[PDB]
T7 RNA polymerase
Amino acid sequence: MNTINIAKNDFSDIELAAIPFNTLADHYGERLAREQLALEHESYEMGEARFRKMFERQLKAGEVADNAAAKPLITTLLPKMIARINDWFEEVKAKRGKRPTAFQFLQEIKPEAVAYITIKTTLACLTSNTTVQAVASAIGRAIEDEARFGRIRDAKHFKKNVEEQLNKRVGHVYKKAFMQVVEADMLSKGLLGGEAWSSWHKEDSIHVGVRCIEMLIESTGMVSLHRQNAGVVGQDSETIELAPEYAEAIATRAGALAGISPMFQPCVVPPKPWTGITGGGYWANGRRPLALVRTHSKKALMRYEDVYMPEVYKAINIAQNTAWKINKKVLAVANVITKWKHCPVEDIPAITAWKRAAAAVYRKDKARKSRRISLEFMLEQANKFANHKAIWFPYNMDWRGRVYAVSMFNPQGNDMTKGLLTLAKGKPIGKEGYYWLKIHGANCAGVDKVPFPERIKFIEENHENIMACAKSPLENTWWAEQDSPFCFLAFCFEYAGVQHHGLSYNCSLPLAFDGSCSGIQHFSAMLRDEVGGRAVNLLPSETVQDIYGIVAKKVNEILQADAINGTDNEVVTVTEKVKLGTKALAGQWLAYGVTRSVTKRSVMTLAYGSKEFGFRQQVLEDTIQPAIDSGKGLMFTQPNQAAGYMAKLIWESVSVTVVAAVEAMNWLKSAAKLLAAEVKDKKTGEILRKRCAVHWVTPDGFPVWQEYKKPIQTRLNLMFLGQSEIDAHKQESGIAPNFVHSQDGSHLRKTVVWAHEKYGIESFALIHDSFGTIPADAANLFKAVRETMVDTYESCDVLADFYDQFADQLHESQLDKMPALPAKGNLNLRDILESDFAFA
Amino acid sequence: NTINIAKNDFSDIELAAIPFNTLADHYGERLAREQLALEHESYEMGEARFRKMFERQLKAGEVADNAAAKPLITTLLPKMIARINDWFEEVKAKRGIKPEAVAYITIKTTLACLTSNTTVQAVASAIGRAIEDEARFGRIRDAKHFKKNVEEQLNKRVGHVYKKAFMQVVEADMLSKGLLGGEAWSSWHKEDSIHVGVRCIEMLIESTGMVLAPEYAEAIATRAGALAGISPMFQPCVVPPKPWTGITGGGYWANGRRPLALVRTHSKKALMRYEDVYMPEVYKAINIAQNTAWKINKKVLAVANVITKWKHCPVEDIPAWKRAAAAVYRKDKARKSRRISLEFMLEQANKFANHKAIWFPYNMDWRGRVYAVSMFNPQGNDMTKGLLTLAKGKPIGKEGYYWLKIHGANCAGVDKVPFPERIKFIEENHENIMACAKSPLENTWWAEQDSPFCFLAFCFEYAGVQHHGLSYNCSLPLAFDGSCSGIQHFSAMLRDEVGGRAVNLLPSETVQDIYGIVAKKVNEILQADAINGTDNEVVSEKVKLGTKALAGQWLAYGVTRSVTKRSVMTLAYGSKEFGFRQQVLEDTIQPAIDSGKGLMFTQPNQAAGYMAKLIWESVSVTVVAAVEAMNWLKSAAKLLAAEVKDKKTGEILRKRCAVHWVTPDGFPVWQEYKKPIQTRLNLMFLGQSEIDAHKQESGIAPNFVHSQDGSHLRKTVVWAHEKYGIESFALIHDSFGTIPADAANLFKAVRETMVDTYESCDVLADFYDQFADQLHESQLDKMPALPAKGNLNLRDILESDFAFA
DNA sequence: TCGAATCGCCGC
RNA sequence: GCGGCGAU
DNA sequence: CGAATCGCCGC
RNA sequence: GCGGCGAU
């Protein structure tokens, strides 16, 4: 209800405590220590204010039970209510006479569901008319709504196709409106048994809630009952109050939670070097200390305390030390255009389907608001730190070891954020620096599928356009028309500077180089796949290699062959419909024209574990369904048959193109499945080998543990929200994408330390496979990122090491099931050193 | 005043809510209640022990020694210490012992006076005496080289007065020499010593509120209360132990404030590392070991009960030099100490004498060696072993009777002869064994043996077989011990054939005495050394005795297995030629001088040093694998513990690193010896976070070999239980025992596990794989290579009868 | 019978 | 958890 | 200066 | 921590 302010004493400690102050002051002076500790203090202040506004809205909406401060108490009272429900039902049955008027109503709703519906609706009613009648009414109408529309949910098979559309709607009235529509539809089909719901009358609903209110006072006792003006027929009223201890418990938990949810901001001094698991980054001893590894359990964090990973610690601290500053020139442009357009680069002037169209505009209206709120935060943070000579971002890691910045405004964000951020410590650009400055500008414009010589040609041909954009960014919109506009505009400014000030010009712009498909690149390196490696530019090639265009080419080759040969159409009975043959289906697709657009997402999702089944849903939504809406797709007479046909063709094309990827992810999936199973002798039933997690260690020395854990029980209501064992399926789903991500994290970490030690590089722009530095150091970073990758996969056999980790854990029945290690290929790793387009 | 945790807290250990039916359905309610009563009582008994100890410290002003008073003192010392220097600055600013010691001496003397004259003068006068006592005596400490010699004698002295008498005598000897300065101690003015006191008191009240303040008095009390609850006197189980399914909670069934831990670790973090580890075979061994059902040998107990009332030690004295006078004092302390342990062991054995079976929970140390949890357990002294026998029995049979005879002759001490002789000794004394069994009080022959109570328990069973034939059921454990487990294990992994004969690992016609082997080699050097030796040369001026001259004395005295004996048992523990020279003097040169012999040794230390290099050289050629291994593991640990810094920069390339290895059973062990950066020691008063390089080096070789034998023991019990019917195991770290019928099968199993493990695993190479990445670029050139494999075949091990393991 | 990557921000 | 945004 | 572990008792 | 005893 009412929460005392954390801020007055406990946030005051952040600036007061001497040991955090002295440690900061010794490194960077008292005054930078003053600013940093006050800034970290404000970060905690902003975070507490964030909680208070959300709590106020949730209290107003009756959604306090949804808030985290109210979840712990509800978990305690819920069993007591349920037990009292079940006993009441048994006690009412035992007694003889007319059954109480709520008995029948309470029965169709699950005893768990009534329990939560009463607690939430009573908490909603009390925190937002305390009379028992209004709350009993409010309970009853909620019980009936779960009763009437629940019938649809459990029926179930049809509900699975209406489940998503229910979720896509926001707000109870919209959820209820949609459910009245489906109920009418399914009643017309006769699915619900043809039984139209007879609405409860008001006096019934009142009696439903009162029995619930009584039942909580006996069992739980949070609410208590009070009678006003007893014995007077006019004013005899009964009222409901919350137990103060329970209100104090949410209030204590609300305050406890507000002090541990800061809004992290950039540092005005270099971030605190990591010496251990906790307390890196920000310098204050804080209520929410940073962790080196972002984990879901304290235990998975504790495993890292013992481990000796000097190279992991060095890489994070080097990355933290990178000095950034706000690009004021970009910020000047963004401050203007943002006031005029919701998205500044969105609409530049330049020279059943209806139901699906309505869903699109609804999503578009959501997307506009969500996009703009992120924009407003980034600009405000950018304008805040604009006048600082440098700022710094702390770094930590996810549980797989990938590196992420900690502050909400960070260099790993969207274009506008990336454009608003530049490095602080620049060097004179030089001939080689100018060259990569133009290559970077070419990539920001979207000229990336072309060799470097034509990338330079594109920049130099558009010299006058680039110059005009830098001189008047508001008068020439050409930069906004580019693929990465603000980052392109950032290049335009530095390009203009080099021409004004020559090659002596000091440029501090981050020149990002990104691996084309890092997962397939890594998988191709492990098993030495030549064909896969060439497709992802691991091996030197005549031109840049587009894996989508390659797969599209192989798809089109099948289509042309399946147009001359291939099955005729046939008629199949279904519970008679025509089943289109491959010859018909090929003709439809050739009529559409299959490009890299048709195959792109399928290749991207390959590292995530997607296969032929998942491609059909991709193909339908990405190309076929938009084609029908556009008035194309007359060829797609049966859309699902076309998608399934094309998904087969994409999967065959992908698997023969990158064999190492397909084989390696299968081997890891088989490993996790065996380890995640419980081994029980069928006759005895006893479990011989328990369910086991998956663990490996990166060549960088980062350990990682995959323990996806499933909760035992869960509850779900239609209109109100729902409120450990190893999850074997998530273990198999996650093992291959997580393993390859742990490798690219090690590659990134090994790159920054190698670029820092062999070469002089001190500034790093890092987005998981994108490696950036100032132009003067661009050539060496290009060198460094290739040298690391060749070294690890010459030094280490990551899959064989992985096998050595879990081979002991395997049970004797499982060993025949385990596949062998995939065969190595003919690729030579030293060709990666001379590969122009790997970028990594 | 200490609150009684026992009232509410020892109801929590009872845990009379976790269904005792969990125990009661499987084993019966009375036994379940008794077990829960026993664990409850075990916690109560320990609390009473703490209280009696605490009171005695209270009477003697020793509360500052007690752990309950420490955590305040460590909080209050630096605030005090800061205030000492603050006045030191103020007095230095205005013209008009260590600071830590002044703080510690003030706090201890004040707390003692209040614990046991509350006047401000009386305490300051006592505090003034201690500071003056520290200054005069501390001059000897800070001189220092001679202090290193007298330090050991101060440590042997006990009681503030008795250390003072010694330091008084040494100061005279130093001064009658003149070593401390010739300046006698200048006695503090009695009014100045009270002035120093008052001054230190006044600082204490300003720095801390302790002067005693109530909050500090309840802090000792609440901590003392918590410490009485976590120190139980563990008792044997009357039901089978709870199987270990995890890191904690095994063994005893009751939920406790101090649950059992699978691995005994000094740090909670070291225990936490074992939770993630999957070691199924380690868990099996502990659970089968816990499942062994024991019974108290009543016949042994009746004999023990009477002789313990008549003799301080039942078997010590049977009717059949100033340093020496210090030793008889030690014997008087010895005679006491054994009696307290004896009386408790008798008390427990009588307490459980009527139970049809008792069980012992098990856990392990950080090296993985398996220890029984109860204070009364089968890993005790000869009388404790004799009081305990297995409950499960099988008819003895011809094979079992043979091993019963073999066990008896080992208890008699005939363990250096072949098995047919060991058999023969028994029937030669067959009439004496009967008489000992028939009337143990009338015949004292059983007490004369090397392991009398075990030999008496053998006498009872040997009589029992003769009464009822081979049909008679015997449940007595028959323990067989490897001659030297460390040398055996080291010789196997490096395939040293020469070592294997010495430890009887190879099949041999006769038992091999490794002490005899090294001694014969020493004699051979000594004989040659008389023929060729460095001449005596004179380097006051003293003549150094030539190697031939030193040989002549040693040859006149002679060298026997006993002289070499220690240097090889110490060798597994890591002792070296430097260490050897002392022990040779103490064991062989010192008793000769008391005997009147040692006339030949003109200089004892010259003989000890000359001897020392002869055992070490003879040891090195006798067991080359054991020496060659131990250097490699030590060399590794030294590199891991060292810090690598850029010589000019000092920036640390590699931190001090602990060493880690995994036993073939899968038990992991991490060796992290840690040394505090600062420590305070006072001469007259009690003494009060980096890897310790010397401890890491000193410990790695013996700790590694212990982890292997524990892995072997754990492997042996699982192998013996699964391949063979054996369900009852008597285990003492390398001694394997079972009922006589099952002995021959365990006799087989202990070989098979040892052979199978070293054929399958190269343990030292695996150890390299663990620290290989940790080694720095400078260290890799320094690191020695792995010692070479030898020509020993491990298939010979299963054939040897004398290895016993 | 079922199902068909990680991290953050905002909203409920 | 659900809805949307963004990063790889 | 620097020459095994685990218990119990005592200080 | 130091001293004594025991197990290996």
About this structure: The radius of gyration of chain A is 31 Å. Chain A touches chain B at residues 302-303, 305-306, 308, 310, 689, 692, 701, 705, 808-809 (CB under 8 Å). Chain A has five domains: 12-321, 322-388, 398-426+505-530+742-829, 427-504, 531-741.
